[PDB]
Design a protein around this nucleic acid. Structure first.
Lengths: 163, 141, 131, 176, 38
RNA sequence: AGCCAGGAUGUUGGCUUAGAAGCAGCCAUCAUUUAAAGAAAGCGUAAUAGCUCACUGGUCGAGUCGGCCUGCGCGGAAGA
């Protein structure tokens, strides 16, 4: 290891993933297993990569105190055990799901998704992101307007209104 | 995945399935028959070739037989058919034995697709970078 | 050919006679029909309760060279079975007997002669008890 | 130092009958219970119990930490009371409790009835388990050690009276 | 146990406490490491 | 210091190997996965093992570790 010369290191070096941070997630991992690194690191194979890091650095005094790069409301955002996660390339979508559709399956606590940066707020997960590049969600998103949204009601008077 | 329920890996060659002299009564004893470990093995082994190492897991429950799902082979045994001499170690690093460079064993680091904890398609090349040095084989890379 | 079953060596510390019934049905492919049932084993062998006669023959230690005095305790809920055997062991007899009735068989002479159930006796050929 | 320093806080209940150098605690259950001290001056004050040394005592602290310790287990003593649990291993081993005197059977050529002490009771949830609760940590601990004694766990088959917080070594015989 | 003029901790779970005027070694792992006097 | 977690994947490493898949063994100890994980500490394999160590995280929150120079003591230490 090393003192300040090493402490400062883990800081700025990784805090760069905060200044120029794509997405953002804070998940504790009490009772985490190796699959913990056989997942966010496995999905990094044929659907991710070295573009993701969850360097458990909840040293707070290091992680939290180490975020002068504007991330207010975080003097609270850094409680107990933590394992921050950030992105560099790619979009700012998916990622939340790697956690949302993993930790939801036991896989240790998920900090109930305390939310992180980007919009900069508090706790209460969202998902308006992973719907990206799933353009067909913007396709049927018109609900055929005329069609479907019609053949669903304007023609429901027959299979549900003839008495 | 879970952890451990029942699985091993003992074998000499695919050129001869379910060996009789080798392992013998040492190829499964907790739900593994010895006259059946050749009806689920050669069911897909005879679909590529016979003569190379084939380890595998052994999902065991309590319903007569069992179920398995093997994968990529070791890149150390491929040095008897895709590298040089018949043996391997023996003479370690005491006198430059065989010699494999950057070119050879290249695509041998391309066969293990899903089975390679080396996300970086390029970096995953450093892994097998040793599956041919357990006997001393300087690389002319 | 029909099979009677005798569970020998109740003088010894043995397995669970429940489990003993499983091993006989499972591995020998034949039904078990308990006639008697041991009360305690080893240093705590007190005798056997007869299921069909509804009475309890009391084991005496070391009379294996002759035939011991036949000493019966009549009821299965006779408070003398508690006194003669200890109320603790007496309840375990009652408990096991409950489970036995839900997982065993009534002795049927026809199925015995057909070799499909065995009358199981528990005893000790050394103590000359159960023979 | 430390354990000593650290305050004891008297929960909602226990009275704390600090009489000069004789402290007594009573609450929920546990017929009171009270011990003596020596080189540690204890002070009630507010909602806790502070423990410190005394001038001219190299025992200070050292005698004070054990002070904290004891009192701290005296509170909880009457509070939550104290646990136990032991389990008999081996075919033929059986516990009973037909009063306040436990009747054990351990393969000896005789029974082994054992009478419980003052404020200690026990039950046998199973013909081979023994749970004895009490408010005095120092006594349950004993009664336990004592019961166990009748037949410790031999390292071969493991038979005998063990706790649960055991470990039981167990090893193989001398080869052939 | 074994009473030697020099006790010494052998194992890693071997302890060394002084019960009475006597230094002893309490090894939790191996009984063979149980010693007195020293 | 407790207490709470992880300690794999290339790899069952090949090898005088009857069978060795870290450890009676030989020679080798390199590279990813990561906050950390050594072809590696120990128990012990028919052999995998199950299960615990270096090292990293969490909790707690003020001291903690071992050598050096000195003073006084302990064991070693059984007899007619």
């Amino acid at each position: 290891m090393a003192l300040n010369l090493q402490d400062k290191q883990a800081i700025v070096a990784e805090v760069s993933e905060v200044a120029k941070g794509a997405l953002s997630a804070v998940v504790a991992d009490s009772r985490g297993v190796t699959v913990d690194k056989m997942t966010e690191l496995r999905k990094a194979g044929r659907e991710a990569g070295v573009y993701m890091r969850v360097v458990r650095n909840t040293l707070l005094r290091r992680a939290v105190e180490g975020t002068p790069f504007e991330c207010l409301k975080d003097a609270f955002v850094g409680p107990t055990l933590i394992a921050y996660l950030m992105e560099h390339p790619g979009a700012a979508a998916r990622l939340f799901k790697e956690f949302a559709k993993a930790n939801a399956k036991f896989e240790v606590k998920a900090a109930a998704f305390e939310g992180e940066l980007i919009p900069a707020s508090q706790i209460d997960r969202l998902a308006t992101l992973p719907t990206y590049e799933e353009a067909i969600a913007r396709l049927m998103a018109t609900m055929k307007e005329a069609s479907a949204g019609k053949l669903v009601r304007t023609l429901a008077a027959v299979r549900e209104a003839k008495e | 995945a879970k952890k451990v329920q029942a699985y091993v890996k003992l074998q000499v060659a695919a050129g001869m399935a379910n060996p009789s002299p080798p392992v013998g009564p040492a190829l499964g004893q907790q739900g593994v028959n010895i006259m059946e470990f050749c009806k689920a093995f050669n069911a897909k082994t005879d679909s590529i070739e016979k003569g190379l190492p084939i380890p595998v897991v052994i999902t065991v429950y309590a319903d007569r037989s069992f179920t398995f799902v093997t994968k990529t082979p070791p890149a150390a045994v491929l040095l008897k058919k895709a590298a040089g001499i018949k043996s391997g170690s023996g003479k370690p690093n005491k006198d430059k034995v065989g010699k494999i460079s950057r070119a050879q064993l290249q695509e041998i680091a391309q066969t293990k697709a899903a089975d390679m904890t080396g996300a970086d398609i390029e970096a995953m090349t450093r892994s097998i970078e040793g599956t041919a040095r357990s006997m001393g084989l300087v690389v002319e890379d | 050919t029909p099979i009677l079953t005798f569970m020998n060596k109740l003088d010894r510390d043995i397995r669970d006679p429940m489990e003993l019934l499983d091993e006989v049905e499972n591995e020998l492919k034949i039904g078990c029909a308990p006639i008697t049932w041991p009360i305690g084993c080893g240093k705590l062998f007190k005798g056997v309760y007869h299921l069909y006669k509804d009475e309890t023959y009391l084991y005496q230690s070391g009379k294996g060279h002759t035939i011991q005095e036949v000493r019966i305790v009549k009821g299965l809920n006779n408070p003398d079975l508690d006194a003669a055997v200890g109320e603790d062991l007496a309840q375990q007899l009652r408990d096991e007997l409950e489970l036995v009735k839900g997982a065993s068989n009534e002795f049927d002479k026809e199925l015995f002669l057909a070799g499909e159930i065995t009358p199981v006796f528990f005893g000790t050929a050394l103590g000359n008890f159960g023979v | 130092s430390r354990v000593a320093k650290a305050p004891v806080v008297v929960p909602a209940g226990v009275d704390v009958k600090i009489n000069g150098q004789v402290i007594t605690i009573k609450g929920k259950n546990g017929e009171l219970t009270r011990t003596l001290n020596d080189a540690v001056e204890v002070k009630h004050a507010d909602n806790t119990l502070t423990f410190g040394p005394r001038d001219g005592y190299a025992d200070g602290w050292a005698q004070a930490g054990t002070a904290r310790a004891l009192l701290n287990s005296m509170v909880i003593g009457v509070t939550e009371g104290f646990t136990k649990k032991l389990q008999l291993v081996g075919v033929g081993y059986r516990a009973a409790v037909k009063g306040n005197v436990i009747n054990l059977s351990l393969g000896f050529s005789h029974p082994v009835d054992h009478q419980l002490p003052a404020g200690i009771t026990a039950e046998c949830p199973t013909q081979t388990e023994i749970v004895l609760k009490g408010a005095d940590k120092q006594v349950i601990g004993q009664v336990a050690a004592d019961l166990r004694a009748y037949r410790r766990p031999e390292p071969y088959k493991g038979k005998g009276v063990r706790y649960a917080d055991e470990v039981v070594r167990t090893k193989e015989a001398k080869k052939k | 146990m074994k009473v030697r003029a020099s006790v010494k901790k052998l194992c890693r779970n071997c302890k060394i406490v002084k019960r009475d005027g006597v230094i002893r070694v309490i090894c939790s792992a191996e009984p063979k490491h149980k010693q007195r006097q020293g």
